[PDB]
Amino acid sequence: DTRTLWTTPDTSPNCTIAQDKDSKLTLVLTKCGSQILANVSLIVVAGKYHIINNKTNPKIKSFTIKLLFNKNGVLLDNSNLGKAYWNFRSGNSNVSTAYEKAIGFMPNLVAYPKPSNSKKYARDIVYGTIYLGGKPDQPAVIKTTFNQETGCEYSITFNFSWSKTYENVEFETTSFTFSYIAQE
Amino acid sequence: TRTLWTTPDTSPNCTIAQDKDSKLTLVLTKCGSQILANVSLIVVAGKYHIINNKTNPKIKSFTIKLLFNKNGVLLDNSNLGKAYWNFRSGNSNVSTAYEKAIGFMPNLVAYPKPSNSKKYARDIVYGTIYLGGKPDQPAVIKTTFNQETGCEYSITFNFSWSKTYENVEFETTSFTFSYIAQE
Amino acid sequence: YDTRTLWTTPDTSPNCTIAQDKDSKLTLVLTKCGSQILANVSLIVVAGKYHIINNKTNPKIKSFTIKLLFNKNGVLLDNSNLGKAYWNFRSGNSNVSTAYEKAIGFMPNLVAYPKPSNSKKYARDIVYGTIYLGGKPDQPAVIKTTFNQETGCEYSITFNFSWSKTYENVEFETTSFTFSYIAQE
Ligand SMILES: CC(=O)N[C@H]1[C@H]([C@H](O)[C@H](O)CO)O[C@@](O)(C(=O)O)C[C@@H]1O
Ligand SMILES: CC(=O)N[C@H]1[C@H]([C@H](O)[C@H](O)CO)O[C@@](O)(C(=O)O)C[C@@H]1O
Ligand SMILES: CC(=O)N[C@H]1[C@H]([C@H](O)[C@H](O)CO)O[C@@](O)(C(=O)O)C[C@@H]1O
Ligand SMILES: [Zn+2]
Ligand SMILES: [Zn+2]
Ligand SMILES: [Zn+2]
């Protein structure tokens, strides 16, 4: 109702992009009535997307992190984010019990409809720019899409892409804030 | 009572050039002293539906105005229609039109009404939305608080672009901003 | 009395020292929404070095920083650029009668944004944004907000204002920027 659904703010890897637990996705979802206030950042610690080099690897330009939810708002097992520490805040960590329901934290289906025969509108997307290493001249685009995945009831997906040729740049980002209309 | 919105549907509610030619999706959530705001626009017909700058070089901007009285009631003078601007009830509105919404109005000390005194830029918020969800099609959304005359409160959205777009449908991604509330 | 809001008040009375005493008004509003702080910021320089920007006359004037430093209790330290006099909890459009003793719930989270130490420094304690001088679209200036990266304090929120363009006689008064950060409690 007014609680926080988050990933914990530690640096302990909780996310799988290319290989297992290669990244820490810090995501904090806070319910303010009909809108959800969201704060996001990413640290890649290992694998394909850890150290970006577009001189040696020119085709590594984008990747996606998917969060898939069922009818009750529980994170599905096939999401990129691990189910382990995706829960309500208890202090600096989480409560002992994994949550039953989080429908109030899901994106609104009327505002952000699933793919169908009807006309797809752009309002289910939010664009933002974060910066690698905190450097102002190293931007990367974060594209957030609501409810556009199949095999779920609700989805939040993060697409990270860049158009610059980076040479040995560690992929860890500044933080970005956005919001979206809630289901309940 | 914590949310003022246009309804999350796609039923056209806004007049830019011709009558009801657009859908302005605006949600205002009260968070104490600040109002969390989320906004997108879909133009369905008329002058600003399919943008062609190579045919029409002058069509580069337009403004949607919301004008309020002392009680925070929307005026029929505004670009957005009064019919579907109300407090949240599920995925729709309350059956009765609201009487007072001063808590949702932009703070007068922070954003003063037009007057002989100095005008500061802090009553403006700048954002970038994208047409058709395409990253290579940016358009500027300029939000201004309490800068219209003939009303007590106002939130205006100015859409502008500097790129030459050919056959591009004006339907936008969402943008989130906030402002200081009157009470 | 509103304990869910820490602000400078939304007036235009100089409260901040960048180059000379009270040369600016920093309007900052911190609204607590559970474990996230919704923040709203703008800057008006009224006098001194950074008031009227002329980069043709003064090529090197391209940046400045406004620092807010806090102790263990979340009280603003006097060596901060922002004056303590009107940094308080909200009462109407003004502040409460007496200065606050605690505001830990408004401080940046320490696990999320750790104090300078021997550990690996992560970029997530930075929020980048762009505001505009005079409200003109062709006059951008980058606002860089960093959490808990100053030494000599327990908490800190710093605002670095910088620009790349050569501005000639431009009054440094900005549009508003909204962001959020994870709260300590
Ligand atoms: C934080 C920020 O806004 N950075 C922007 C920078 C800076 O204006 C300059 O590098 C001066 O620091 O310019 C860019 O064109 C770039 O480098 O790709 C876009 C980027 O978004
Ligand atoms: C979402 C986003 O930030 N898009 C930006 C794009 C993309 O960086 C590139 O098109 C790579 O896809 O580049 C622009 O110069 C453009 O096309 O006008 C600015 C625009 O704001
Ligand atoms: C509000 C906004 O996005 N302004 C942007 C402007 C405008 O697109 C053009 O001036 C057209 O008015 O273009 C810039 O390249 C510039 O002038 O430095 C970046 C700046 O951020
Ligand atoms: Zn690393
Ligand atoms: Zn259309
Ligand atoms: Zn001045």
Numbering used by the authors:
A (entry chain A): 182 to 365
B (entry chain C): 183 to 365
C (entry chain B): 181 to 365
Task: Give sentences copied directly from the paper behind this entry.
Epidemic keratoconjunctivitis (EKC) is a severe ocular infection and is caused by the highly contagious adenoviruses Ad8, Ad19, and Ad37. The initial event leading to EKC is binding of the viruses to glycans that contain sialic acid moieties on epithelial cells in the cornea or conjunctiva through trimeric fiber structures extending from the viral particles. The receptor-binding domain, the fiber knob, is located at the C terminus of each fiber and contains three separate pockets that each can accommodate one sialic acid residue. The crystal structure of the fiber-knob protein shows that the three known sialic acid binding sites are separated by distances of about 10 Å.
Instead we selected the three small and flexible scaffolds tris(2-aminoethyl)amine, 2-(aminomethyl)-2-methyl-1,3-propanediamine, and 2,2-diaminomethyl-1,3-propanediamine for conjugation with the sialic acid derivative 1 through the use of squaric acid chemistry and thus prepared ME0322, ME0323, and ME0324 in modest to good yields. We reasoned that longer flexible spacers would enable all three binding pockets to be occupied simultaneously by one molecule. Only the terminal sialic acid residues of ME0322 are visible in the final electron-density map. We did not observe electron density for the rest of the compound, probably because the flexible linkers do not make defined contacts with the protein. It is, however, likely that all three sialic acids in a fiber knob belong to the same trivalent compound. Analysis of the crystal packing shows that the distances between sialic acid binding sites in different knobs are too large to be bridged by a single ME0322 molecule (data not shown). The binding of all sialic acid residues and their interactions with their respective protein chains are identical to the previously established binding mode between the sialic acid residues of sialyl-α(2,3)-lactose or the GD1a hexasaccharide and the Ad37 fiber knob. The binding was shown to fit to a simple one-to-one binding model, and the calculated Kd value for the interaction of the Ad37 fiber-knob protein with ME0322 was calculated to be 14 μm. Compound ME0322 proved to be very potent and inhibited the infection of HCE cells by Ad37 virions with an IC50 value of 0.38 μm.
